[PDB]
Amino acid sequence: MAPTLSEQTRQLVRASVPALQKHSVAISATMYRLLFERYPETRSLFELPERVIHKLASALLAYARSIDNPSALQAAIRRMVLSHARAGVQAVHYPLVWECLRDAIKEVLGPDATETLLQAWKEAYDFLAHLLSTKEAQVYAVLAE
Amino acid sequence: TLSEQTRQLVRASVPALQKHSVAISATMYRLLFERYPETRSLFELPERVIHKLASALLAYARSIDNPSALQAAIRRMVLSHARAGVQAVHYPLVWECLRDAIKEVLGPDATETLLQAWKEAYDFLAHLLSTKEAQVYAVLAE
Ligand code: HEM
Ligand code: HEM
Ligand SMILES: [Cu+2]
Numbered sequence A: 001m002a003p004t005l006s007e008q009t010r011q012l013v014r015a016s017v018p019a020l021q022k023h024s025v026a027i028s029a030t031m032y033r034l035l036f037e038r039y040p041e042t043r044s045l046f047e048l049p050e051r052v053i054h055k056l057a058s059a060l061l062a063y064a065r066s067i068d069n070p071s072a073l074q075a076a077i078r079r080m081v082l083s084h085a086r087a088g089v090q091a092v093h094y095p096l097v098w099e100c101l102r103d104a105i106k107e108v109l110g111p112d113a114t115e116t117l118l119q120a121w122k123e124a125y126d127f128l129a130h131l132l133s134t135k136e137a138q139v140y141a142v143l144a145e
Numbered sequence B: 001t002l003s004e005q006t007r008q009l010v011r012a013s014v015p016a017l018q019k020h021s022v023a024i025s026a027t028m029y030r031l032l033f034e035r036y037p038e039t040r041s042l043f044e045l046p047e048r049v050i051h052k053l054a055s056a057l058l059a060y061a062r063s064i065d066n067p068s069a070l071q072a073a074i075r076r077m078v079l080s081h082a083r084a085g086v087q088a089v090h091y092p093l094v095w096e097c098l099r100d101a102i103k104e105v106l107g108p109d110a111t112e113t114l115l116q117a118w119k120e121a122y123d124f125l126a127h128l129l130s131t132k133e134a135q136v137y138a139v140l141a142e
């Protein structure tokens, strides 16, 4: 549960909320298409890919709106954990989805996807990823026995 | 564990479930909708879940003699229940609706010894599900 959210990360993530209000669906859909074509093993995980795309778009927006208080997203984090565990999402998938999410941001935001903004979102992603993946491992261990 | 008599009756129910499980599951959802409106919050995709429960009833009866072939399906049920917020106190409510759906779909075949066998079979599965959901709930608190 180690990683953290620096002051600069929070400021830049907070500032992208206007772009996410307009483009989070484009970012989420583009992210999933890059994942579909770069890592075909993962397509077996998505029962309803269209529905998940709009859920992730909302989560990105909500997460950016609450980057100063991540604990206010406890219920939504719970949903993500149990959805992932239901589908068999694994710890090693998280680098792949970041790779596709980085390039989704680079594509949709065009010039506004500066390297500082991408580094802020990488840290915000790594925080959320480390929290989701560790709680999922715990849930897996409980259902094994 | 389940008595020999209720396992013979669950086995005898497989023909009814291969033809009517959808009707039983749909009627059971429609009854739950009208009798306990607080639960409608829990269902995001009611149509899809009706068909998933129908297939789970059929699979449960078809392997009533070793519920371990349902290990993957039980996992899915447990994680979907946790994700939706299903509680131990909900299981009596869905039994009353499943019993009345069996009564309605099986008609005269839904005698009281058949319904008693399904009460025992449901209670076994509900116990297995709800205890695993409590363990999952406890870890989400950490
Ligand atoms: C920080 C990283 C991630 C975030 C923020 C995120 C976000 C979400 C959200 C909000 C949902 C919908 C949950 C719901 O409300 O039902 C979801 C579901 C899903 N995600 Fe992700 N996710 C992440 C990582 C991943 C990874 C690494 C994979 C690997 C393939 C993945 C694949 C899936 C699948 C298959 C589902 C649907 C599972 C189900 O509904 O049963 N996600 N995710
Ligand atoms: C022995 C009892 C039960 C059985 C056999 C059963 C069966 C199932 C199955 C097969 C699913 C879908 C699994 C999947 O998503 O792949 C499901 C989900 C669900 N069940 Fe039940 N269930 C039981 C008890 C209950 C109870 C008591 C409630 C209380 C309202 C309930 C409400 C729900 C809801 C809301 C979902 C959807 C969860 C989601 O989609 O995230 N279930 N159940
Ligand atoms: Cu769409």
Ligand SMILES: [Cu+2]
Pocket (backbone or CB within 6 Å): B022, B047, B050, B051
């Ligand atoms: Cu139907």
